[PDB]
Amino acid sequence: GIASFHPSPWGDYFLKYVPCDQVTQAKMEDEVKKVEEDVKKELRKLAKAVGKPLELLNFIDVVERLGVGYRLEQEIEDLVQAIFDNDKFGVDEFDLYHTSLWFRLLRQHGFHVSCDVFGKFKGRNGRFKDSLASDVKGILGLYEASHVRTHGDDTLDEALVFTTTHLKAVVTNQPNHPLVPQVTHALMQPYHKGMPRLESRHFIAFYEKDPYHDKTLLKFGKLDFNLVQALHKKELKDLSRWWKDLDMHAKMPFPSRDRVPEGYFWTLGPFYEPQFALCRKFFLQVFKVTSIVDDIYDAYGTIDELTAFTKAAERWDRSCLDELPEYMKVSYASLIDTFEEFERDLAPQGRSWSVKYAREEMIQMCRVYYQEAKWCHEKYSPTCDEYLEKASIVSFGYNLGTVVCFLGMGDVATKEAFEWARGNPKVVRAAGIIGRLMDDIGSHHFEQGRDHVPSAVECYIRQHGVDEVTAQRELGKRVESSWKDINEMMLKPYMMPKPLLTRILNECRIVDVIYKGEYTFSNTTMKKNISHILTDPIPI
Template structure:
């Protein structure tokens, strides 16, 4: 078929070129590495000692934890933090009764983020707590003392800027029926927006940053990088923590650069002839780094990186290159038992996405066989089959210029988001905790609530962000268009409805993160983190994965290019 009938997107070239193939970093030197890792061990011991000394001062302990987490160091102290938070949780009521807005909000946020159910009224038995959780009524009466008798927040709390900022950050861990947190979010956002221009630095920068990027929805590495700068400006900062955070950040950055370099070499080594695709390997790796950055997940990133990149090529083949006849053939080939010899039976350009996916899964099997875990890769293959069927459906809608209803669209679009596939792929290299039961849980139809929520967030922020670019060419209708054409909304109304749906999905994710967990917490954290990646990459109605986006380039460079000056 002629080029004319292809829905080619003309994506811009890769911004990073071969930067990561040629990068040199002193931390890549083995001797330097060993010496720095010794330093890290010493810092870990020092911090553990300080944690012991602070144990009996709940407020100091809380501030210490908040700093450890925000500086990106919490992964060194998982057990210590968990134990101490249990203690804080048990003395929760007494603490809240006498504390200021800043500490009440910070404690509430940290406990919720760690899955602790935090009422602050009567002490309930565990049975009642579980019952309340099943009814999903999470009381927010810890904040009642900051409200007037008429139910609105006291204007006097706006004088306490740090307290108001902390309330704003806490309101993002809300779940359904958290009325008081819905009000807190509206109140704090309005008041902080009104005062930000009158504040002086560094507080002004902190407030502006939080309004642009709430902590709970930010990518952990990006937020840690930012917070290290903020923390350094705080005259009361803990010197040990600050030095430790900088060293740890730079060591991890060196590891991440190496992983990205390996991924780039792998991709080049596949010798694919697919110039129509988005050359976004650095962005793809940055996205994955949002899901997990810890050294122990290095294998997980390697496996997920290859699958992510092969999936992105598949997406572009269906979305911006193949003709319906070619795509039907490709879909059919994916439904059969996978075999590299089928590559030659496929049309010239679409065969590369088949080749890349088969290759990525075979290599994942080889990597996981060492741990006796190659069985999990079949769950990924099943997801790819489902993905191709859904991609094909969208391609047909596009070809027929058919605009589905919103519900009809979402049924397919949640699959093509493609987080049901991505979440399973992110579990592959995570070791023992990703059991057969976990993959069965994640693969079920209908999609589990947490997976559906993350997929909804990605799909809708992508549609709000990519709508204009995609509609410049022949492209499947987006959620925005479905609402405009089938449900009679204006573009603004459609975007508003989609933003509400995204907020609802966030409440579902926050709910899933509360104990008792349906699967183990490290796995649920991947789902939460992938939702965060989507929020950041499609921030402010832009598609940072597809188009050149200055803000995203800066965030990527801050995490992957520039080390922190010690």
Template sequence: MQKPDPEVEKRIETLKEDVRKMLSNAAGKATLEELLTLIDTLQRLGVAYHFEYQISQALQSIYNNNINGSDDDDLYTIALRFRLLRQQGYSVSSDVFKKYVDDNGEFKATLANDARALLCLFESSNLRKEGEDILEQLQRFSTRQLKLMLPHLNSSFAEEVNRTLELPLHKRMPRLEARQYISIYEADAARNDLLLEIAKLDFNSLQKLHRTELCDLSRWWKAIDFATKLSFARDRLVECYFWILGVHFEPKYSISRKYMTKIIVIASVIDDIYDVYGTLDELKLFTNAIERWEVLAANDLPEYMQVCYFALLDVVKEMEDNLVNEGRSYRVHYAKEAMKALVRAYFVEAIWFNTKYVPTFEEYLEISVMSSGYPMLSVQALVGLEEVATKEAFDWAISVPRIIRSSALIARLVDDIHTYKVEEERGDAPSGVQCYMKDHNVSEEEACKKIKEMVDIAWKNINEEIQEPNHPPLPLLLPSLNLARMMEVLYQNGDCYTNSSGKTKKRITSVLVDPIPI
């Protein structure tokens, strides 16, 4: 197992101090565009977590001193300022873009030639809330113009434009974005070599930590021997770790990351038990055992279910032992309640399947939001957080507030759009597409269109929750945002979790296996 290289770690610390000075100087002397570009570059290179305080202070100052933007600011600067502030949780009005609309309600022709500004504008439009018509127009306009310009752009920039139009920055996995952006930044003649060096060294250093965590998890997984004892279930430990890496990648979340990976991989196995293997009588026993959450409850279970049941109890108990030492054992109650709610939803879906019941679309959504697993994971993501995860924070999360529900809707509906045909052929329980078709007497195409619109609205709701003036602290909101992002990433080209041998395997390799050449 690789250990951190002391010389490399020392060099990273030196570079961090240099970047802090760079941020401090930029905040005092640089233009607004230069400061915003520096912050954006640090975020995209994946090293902004080292400079959270300095970046937070800089953005607070920009927000306070430049509320509506300056008349002298160009489109690129206005769009970048808008995006960086909104993603930091500031409520910034979209009216800043109105000056680019002429008297006929059309965007001024002068905007059409600046590809860099248009790309930034497109990225910014993805942080829109419900009812922001000007951002809807801007997204359509920037998309159309960028596509027209593509044949005339240099190859590397054209590739970046294509990648963004396929999946905007706001919906990407931060760690994967860092890996890809480092290569883009290295090819940029205007790059800062100091930033490039710290990005490469830090990425490789983190990659070693993540690989060590995955090795620990692999030993745990092999010791339980799920792959042999529950051969019907998907063996997806690495994919599950990659999923959770999208929620929290920073070193301080190491224990939380391993705990969440164990939870999600066990939940995946439980999902398969309810979906493809257990009889309804067995599933009733398992549901009751989870409700009781005690060792003796396993006596009622078939042997294959006991393997899964004991593994779950052991993982939560191990986390509880960690939390007792920190005086935070109250969190375990919420971890258990979140898992119980997930299993209840699985059981309802199993009853529907076994009784051939086709729910209404509303019934389907009520249950499938929970069975997506995201409300459960959103609670588990707080279990390993620092002081910000108070009892009140857990009461908030367990109630499935709007941001968690929206993230869960994205999880369920994006899954449905990509898997409903395969599931229909397999004879699975009805998907959201089928329920919507039956409920509203519409075609498959119309149902898919409507569900995609619902996903779009859910994204706007997430944005609104993050930008609410009195929103909860960002560390409580980011897991829901990052979980939604992972759904878009893993299902960008179909179900690349269940069928992970193609694009997902390449992405996992780039993040967890191949270091960046120095």
């Protein structure tokens, strides 16, 4: 009632999930496999067809945006490779939508195809023809393709401005145009920058409204979505039990109590496909443990108590439990226990040796937390570049996030990849810059800062002597440059194996979804995003 600050939007809904029995689950599995083989047969048909470039382009695009391209991964990559090798594929004669589709697909699969294919859509000024604004479909396609841009894609930089202006006008002057639901959604969330699972859920609904949609592809996307959603909800029921058990170790509740759905929503970002259950188990659990130690560093304890907790984290041993103040013991024990559990989970595969790399990242998290605490306790005001480089990029959590993602991926995560991520590569820093800058820009305005608690916008304002609007614009430029670094990371040849780079790309995407500021955690948008992918199956 009054003074009640205990929101429980979800209650026991996820704990009360009842999975269907094994006979049923295997029946649904075989149904979806039957339609998968149907899709693959039709795909083979389109590949050997003599002309017909656009049909194969659209078929590939639809299976990808329906969220079932993972069930056809190899088949698609080969096909796109063939398209890239066909130097007489006919791109010169495509309209805006299909030129944009060819460009976007090729860029997303690592092929560094040129922006010159867009030249025929420019006028004498060197700008895109405003006459193209009547081709709503093609403007939408160009808008979506422009978000794969890297450094040196000035055409795509201007294409984003051009398409944004015309798409906003479509929303405003043509409210009843058949594409307005899609245009409005894309303006809020470009597909390439959204969470794969959630954007595929929305595209399934859009695709059903397309009069020319392929019925078997729509059925494939719906059936696989419901199959994969049952796996998610079984995982979330179990992980809810584990999280609740951890919460009941303390007498007073942690802030993260009842926040398993939000944490698991986060966890679905890097990976939603069935084969990453172990990945999702690790990411969720580290998420909870991180939240718990974050509570320690955000409380009203002394800087000596925070020093002791950081040192004890560096030693990483239960002997430290007797030396720590009472209120820190549950969090410290959870650190030791959870990573021991990771070791047990990886022993049958002979992979326990890797837990070490995640443990070090966790120790790093404590160190940067300590630094942030220190800056506040000793009333030091860093510059923006100092705030980022010394604590805040890493304290966002993606140096730990990337290593924990690799933790569950099996033989592809070699020791060499763990050491690569441990050395703070440029792309992991980019993911962290995106997250940290969006979190800080959206958290509060300048006049709502906390004295002596550094933040990116306040640090930029005090360092460069500019106003809030300017600081927001320059930091937004840093976010955009980091996004271009991420898109260059997906261009061949790959630094690390693609399954590993894709985790970092997805970490950036889930941040674009959660920190859509213009709230951050546990608000109405988060509740609706969870409702979209984790409550009911898709009808029929």
